[PDB]
Predict the structure.
Amino acid sequence: EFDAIKIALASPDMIRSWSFGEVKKPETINYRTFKPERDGLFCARIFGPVKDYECLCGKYKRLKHRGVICEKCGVEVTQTKVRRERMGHIELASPTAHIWFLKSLPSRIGLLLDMPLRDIERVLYFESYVVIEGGMTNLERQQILTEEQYLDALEEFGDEFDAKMGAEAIQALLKSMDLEQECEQLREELNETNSETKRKKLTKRIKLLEAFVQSGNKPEWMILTVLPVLPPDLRPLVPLDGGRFATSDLNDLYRRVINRNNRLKRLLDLAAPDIIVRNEKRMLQEAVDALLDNGRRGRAITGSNKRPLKSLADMIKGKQGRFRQNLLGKRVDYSGRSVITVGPYLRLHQCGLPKKMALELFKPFIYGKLELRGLATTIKAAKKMVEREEAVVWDILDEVIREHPVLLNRAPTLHRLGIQAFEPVLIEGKAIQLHPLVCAAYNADFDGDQMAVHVPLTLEAQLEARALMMSTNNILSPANGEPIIVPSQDVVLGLYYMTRDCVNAKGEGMVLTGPKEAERLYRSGLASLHARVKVRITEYEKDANGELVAKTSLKDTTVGRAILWMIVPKGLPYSIVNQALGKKAISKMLNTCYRILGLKPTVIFADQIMYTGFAYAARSGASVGIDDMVIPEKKHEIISEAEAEVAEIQEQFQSGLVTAGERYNKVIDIWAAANDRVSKAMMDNLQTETVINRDGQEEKQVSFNSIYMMADSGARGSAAQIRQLAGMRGLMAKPDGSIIETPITANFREGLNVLQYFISTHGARKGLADTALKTANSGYLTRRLVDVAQDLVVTEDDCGTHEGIMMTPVIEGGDVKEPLRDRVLGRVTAEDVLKPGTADILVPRNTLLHEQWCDLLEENSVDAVKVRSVVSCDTDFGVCAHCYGRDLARGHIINKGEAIGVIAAQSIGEPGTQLTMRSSIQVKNKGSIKLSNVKSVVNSSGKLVITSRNTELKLIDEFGRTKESYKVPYGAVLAKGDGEQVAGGETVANWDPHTMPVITEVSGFVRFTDMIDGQTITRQTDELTGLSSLVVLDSAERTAGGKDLRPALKIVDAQGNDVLIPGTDMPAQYFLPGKAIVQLEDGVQISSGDTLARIPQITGGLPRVADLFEARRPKEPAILAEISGIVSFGKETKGKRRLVITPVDGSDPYEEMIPKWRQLNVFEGERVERGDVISDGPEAPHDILRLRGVHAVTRYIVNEVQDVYRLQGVKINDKHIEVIVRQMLRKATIVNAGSSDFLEGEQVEYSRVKIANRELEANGKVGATYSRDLLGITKASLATESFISAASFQETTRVLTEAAVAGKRDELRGLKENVIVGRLIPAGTGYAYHQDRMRRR
Amino acid sequence: MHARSTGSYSLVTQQPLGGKAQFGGQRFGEMEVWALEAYGAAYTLQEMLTVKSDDVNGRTKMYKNIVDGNHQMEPGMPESFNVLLKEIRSLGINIELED
Amino acid sequence: ARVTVQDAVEKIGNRFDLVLVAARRARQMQVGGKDPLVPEENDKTTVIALREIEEGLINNQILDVRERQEQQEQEAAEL
RNA sequence: GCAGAGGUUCUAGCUACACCCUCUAUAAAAAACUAAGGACCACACGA
DNA sequence: CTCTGAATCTCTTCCTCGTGTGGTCAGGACG
DNA sequence: CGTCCGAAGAGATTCAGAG
Ligand SMILES: NCc1c[nH]c2nc(N)[nH]c(=O)c12
Ligand SMILES: [Mg+2]
C-alpha cells in the first residue's frame, strides 16, 4: 500500500481536520451508571460507540442502522473498533508553546529568532516582556524589557510600542519574521564573517531557515492553539479491580489541562484582574508542558505515591515505550518454554518435545485434521475431543508432527546460531531434550537452563526452517571458518580411553583378521581395548577423481583403534585413527571428513562418533578419587628451601644491603620459581608415573591416572587446574592488584588455612563482580554494532573497482602473528598479483582465492597480495558479492541478499562476553637487514649513528619473507651495515634506550648559534662524564634568555667559516632540545657523527573495543604534522608554545599551539612530513583518516581490534570488522561546491555526493570535492537519512524534533524500518519480492 | 512448562499478555529478530511479527486457513504501529503513510 | 524425510530462491489438485516438493511452463 | 437473517471477521458454522 | 583584543529473558 | 445522579589571554 512515511509539523487546520469532536468537560465517566460522559475524555458522540452496533441510549441498534445517527443519545451506530482511531481536539484559550521545540538540544524557536533560550524561557512563562513591533522608539523589535521597565516605557510612550508577555508574544514574533529576507541577510553576513566561530552559528541558522522555507511548514505552527487528544481506547481507564475503574496516568494530565483551560476561559469572560489571568495562563502552559513532556522543565507532576506521571513523550522513548518494547520485540503466539535435558538417543536434526506441550502448540492442526478425517463435526466437538485427551488425538498428533520443524531458542541469542530449527520427537517427560552436540553452539547448559519452542506455521516458514535453519545445515560458524559441532566432554574421554596403548595387556601380538574380529575379541573378553596387535585394514583413498581405490595392508595398531575404524567413512585414510585421539584430533577428523567428503556423510560421522564415545566412556568407568590426586614428594623440600631463601632476603633487608622494593621483588621472584618447580614435579609424578611389567624388565608408560586422562585428552580441565589440585595454588593477588608476598602453599587436596581462604576469596569475588557487568557491557556493545550496520545487504554482483587494501602478514616484532595464508583466504584479488619473478602473472585479476590458490602464493613466497575490501566498494546502498568475498559459513561466493551487516555485528558482539572488562634489538634467525629512510653518517669511532628517528629494522630472510620488524630512534648506534647478512642472536642496533643523542651530520667546528652560555647552554660541572658539560636545559627549565636564544648548533671552521650541510647551502644547524647534555665546548673540532647532546628518558579489554569502534579521542592525542614543512618555534613558549611548520615551496604557515607540559619530540630546524609524530602518544583515528587515508585508518582499526581479540584466543575474520568500518565513514563534508546544489558546510551522504558527481561528470560539468569523515558508531547510526531507524536507537525526542522541523520522508528500504512496518525484509527470501516491487515502480 | 496456541489480547491488541498465570507467549526479543535476520529468514519474520502477534484481520484469517488445510498468510499491518502513529499524532507532529 | 538439503541447493545456488520455488510447488500440491511427480513416501507436501526439486523434475522454468500450459488450457476452455 | 422474524445447540451466538437454516407475524421443526478486561512501583531468585 | 584551547554546564545512557511475591493511585462534599 | 470541588562520554556552553 504505502511506499514511504512522511513526517511534518502539524497545523491547527490539520489538527481540527483530524478531530472528530471537541472535548470540553474535564470528567471521564459516572461512578453510578458507568456510562461515557457528555463531553468528557471518555465520550461517545465525539469518539464512537461503546458497544458494537449499539447506541448509548440503547435505542434502534438494528445493526442494519450502521451509518445512522441516533438523535436520542447523539452517537452514530457503528463498530466499537472506531474508538481507537478517531481523535478529538481541545481549543486552548491562550496560545501555548510546544516544549519539544522550545527546550531541546538546539532550541528550535531560540535558533529561529536568534534569541538566547533564557529570555524566551522568561517571556514564555510570563516573567519578562519582549516588545514586538518596536517602532521609532529607542527599543527595537527583539528588545527584552523588565516588568518595571515595561511600565516605565508604557508611561513614556503609548505609541505602536507593544510589549507583549506570554506565548502570544512568541507567536506574533514568529509571524512577523520574514524568512526570505533573513535568509539573504544571514547569507550576506556569512560572506562578511572571516573566521569559523560566527560561521558555525550562521550555517546552523541558515540551514534552519532553508529547511523551513523548503518543506510545507510555517514558523508560527510551533505554538499550539488546538491540542489534539489520543483516541480514548488507547488510554484505557478500565482496571475493574473492586470497582475502582481508575488507572490512567495520561487521563489525569488531560483532565488537568482541560480544567486549567476552562478556568482560564471563565476568568477571561469575567474580566478578572490581569495578574490572575496571567497566573492562570502560566498554569495552562505548565499543564500543557506536563502533558507533552513531563519532567523537561525541571519539575514533575506527580502524586501517586510521589512518582512522576507518564506523559505522551514517556510512552515513545526509552526501553519501555512503543518503539523498543512493542514494535521490535513483539511477543508471539504458538510458543512454549521448559527446561533442557540431554537425551543422547536423539539424532542431530531432531530434539525432544513433551507431549503435553505439543498437544497445545499444535492444537489448530489437530482441529483441522480431526475435522478432515470426520472424527468431529464442529470446532466445539473437536475441542472437547482434544480436552478429553482421547487415544485418537495422539495418533492424529503423530501425523501433524512428522515433518514440522520447531525453532528452539535460548534467551541470550548473541549470534545467529542461537535460534536453530529441529524436527520434533515426542517424549513423555516435561522437558525439551537437546542433542548433546548442539549444546555448544547454543552455549546450552544443563544446570536448569530454559529454552523457548516456537512453531513455524506457513508453508514458506516450514520450507525455510528446513533449508536455512536446520541443525544439519549449520556446520561452520559464520565468523570463523571452524566447525561448530565439536565433541566436548564425555565422547572425547571415551575416544581417548578407547584409542590408547598399554605395554602389556591380555591379547598382545595376535594377528587379527579385521575390525569385525577385533570387536568380537573385545566383546568376548579374550583381549582388552588397548593392546598392540596386527590387524589388516582396508583403507579407501579418493586420489582418483571420484573413484575410491582400495588398499588392504597389515597396519600395526591397537584393538581399540581397530574397533573405531568401522565408524570412520570410506574416504578418509587410516592415520586419523592411529593417534591418541584427544580433542583437537577429533575436531580435525571431523573437519577432514567435511573437506574430503560432502556434508551428508559428516552428520552421520558426528552422530556415530558421539554414540561410540558415550558407549566406551560408560564402559570405561573413569572415576575420580582422592588417591588419584598425587602430591609430588619433593613439595616439602621445595617449600623449605623457598622459605630459607625468603629468610635470607629478609636478613639482607635488615642489614640494609637491599631496599624494601628490592626485597619485595626478590621475594616474589623466588616464590614464583618455587611455584614453577612444584608444578614441574607434580606433572612429572602424574604424566608418566605408571611402570608396567613388559614381559620382563618394567617399562615406563603414559599414566592412566583419571585426572591425567581428563586433562591430557581435553575433556574438562587444563594443566593449571590440575596444578591447583596437587601443587601449590600460587601467588594470589590483593584487590588493588599487588601480589601478596606470602603465597598459598596448600593445595585443594590438603587443608586450606583461614587466611589463605580469605586471600582466595579476594580473587573469586573480583572475578564474579567483573563478570556481572561484563554481561551488560557486551549486550550494549552488541546492540550498538547491530544498529550501526543493520542496512547492509549484498545487492550487486561485481563492483568493478580496481582499488583495494594490501594484505600482508602481521609481525609485531617477535614473530608472525598471522600468516598471509589466513588473511587472504576467502577474499578476491584486487588486481593482477604477480610472483617475485618479474613479468610472471601468477594469480589473475579477479579470482576468489580457494585453499589451493592460497597454497600457490605460499609456494612462490608472495608476501603482499592486493585484496578487495568492503571499504573500497563503489556500489551505492549495499556492497557487491566480489568485494565481500567468501560466505565463511558455506564455502562459496556470497549469495546476493545475505545480510552481511547483522552477521558481522553479531560476530563482533558474541566474543565480547568473554573479553575481560578490566634497547638491544635482538634477532631470531639469520637473514639480511633493511632500513627505510636512513640518515646514515659514520662517526669517528666507526659506528652507524643515524639522524633518522622514525626508521625501522625490517629483517628479510633469503626467501624475502619479512621475519621481524623493529624501530630505531634518533641517533641509534647500529652494529651491522644495511643490506648485510647479519649473524644469529646478536643485537643489530645496540643503542642506549634512555639517552637521546644529538649527532653531528657534518664535522668541523662548533659555533654557539643562539646558545649564549648560562641561559640555554649551562656548562655546569658534570662529574658524570668527568668534565663540565654544556647541558641544555628544558624549554621551560632554562631562563627567559634561554628561550629567546633557541639552542642551535652551527657547523663552522677554525676561523668561524660556516660549513654547510652537503646538499643545502645553509650551514648545518642542530637545534638541540631540552635536557640535552652537550659535551663539545665552543671552539672544538668535531667528527661527522660525534654525539653532542644526550637526553636520558591504556586498557585492553571491552572498553578498548568500545573506544575503538566509537572513535573516542585519547587522553593525549599524538600531535601530527598537517603539512610537510620545516619546523620553527614561533615564540618563546609564551603561554602557548607555537610551531611554524611551513613548506619549502608551499607558503601556508600552519601553526599549532602545543602545550608546554606536552613533550615536543620534534626539533626546531628539522623538516617533518605530513603524518609525522611531533608529540608522542596514541594516534587519534580522525587524524589518521584526514592525514593518510581511509585505507590507513582501516588497517589501523582492524589491526588494533584484532590485537585486542587475539590476546584472549577468539578468532574473527577481518571482513566483519571492515564492514563496520565502512558503515562508520558514510558521511563526507563538502569542500568545494562546484556546479552542484550542495553548499559548503554540509554533511552530505557519501553515496549521494558520489551519484551527483557521476551525473555531473557524465555531461560537461565539474563535480564536487569532499572530505571523508569518521563518526562514532553511536553517532553515525544517529545521522542516517531515515527518521524511523534512528528513532529506534537512542534519543527519540531529538530525532523526532529534527525530522519534524525538516519535514523528512523516510523511504524505508532498510532492514529494521521494514521490521517496524511489518513487511518482508529486503535481505533474506524477501529480496526477490522487494526487487520485483522496485521493478514495478 | 507453559505452551499456549492463543489467548486474550492486550490493550495494544498484542495477543500474548505474557507469563504463566495468564496464558502468554515467550517474547521474540530484538536479539532473536537479529538472529533471524542473519539467516535468509524473511517469511518467518513476517509471520512472527504480523500474523502471530497483533493483526486483528490476520490472526482470524490464518486460524480459519489452518483449520481448513492451507497454511497461507495475509500480512496486514501491526496494531502497535497504528498505536504509535496515533501517539505521535497526538504530540502535535503530523506523521502519515504516504503512497 | 529429507535430512540435508545440500542436494536440493545444487539446483539453486541462491538458496533463498530455492525456498521461494518450493513454496509454489508445495502450495500447488496442497491447495491445488496436482498429484506429485515423485512416489509419495508418506511425506508432507514440503518434503515432497524438495525431493522433486532434487531429482530435477521441478524448477522455476518447468513450473512456469506448466503454468503457461494451464493458462492456455483455460483459454481453450473459455472459448 | 433472501428482506423482516425466530432458531436447535456446543458460554454468548443477524458482525467479532462472522455464518447458515427454516418460516410469513411469531415462534418452532433441523444439521453445518467462532474466541471477549490487564495501569504503574518495590523486593527476591535462576541461566 | 578577539576568538586559541581551556574549562563549565547541563543531558543522555547503562543485557535479556524467564520464575514469581507484596504494594498500588486522582478528589469529598453539594446543590 | 451528576456536578462541582556513579561514570563516562557528548553536547551544549562560556571564558579567555597572547602574539
Ligand atoms: N449466530 C447465529 C445463531 C444464533 N443461534 C443460531 N442457531 C442456529 N441453529 N444457527 C445459527 O446460525 C444461530
Ligand atoms: Mg546453564
Q: What stands out?
A: Chain A touches chain C through 28 residues (CB under 8 Å). The first strand of chain A starts at residue 4 and ends at 9. Residues 105, 195, 197-198, 241, 244, 246-249, 251-252, 255, 303-305, 307, 337, 410-413, 450, 452, 773, 775-780, 782-783, 1135-1136, 1153, 1155, 1290-1291, 1294 of chain A lie near DNA strand E (CB under 10 Å from a C1').
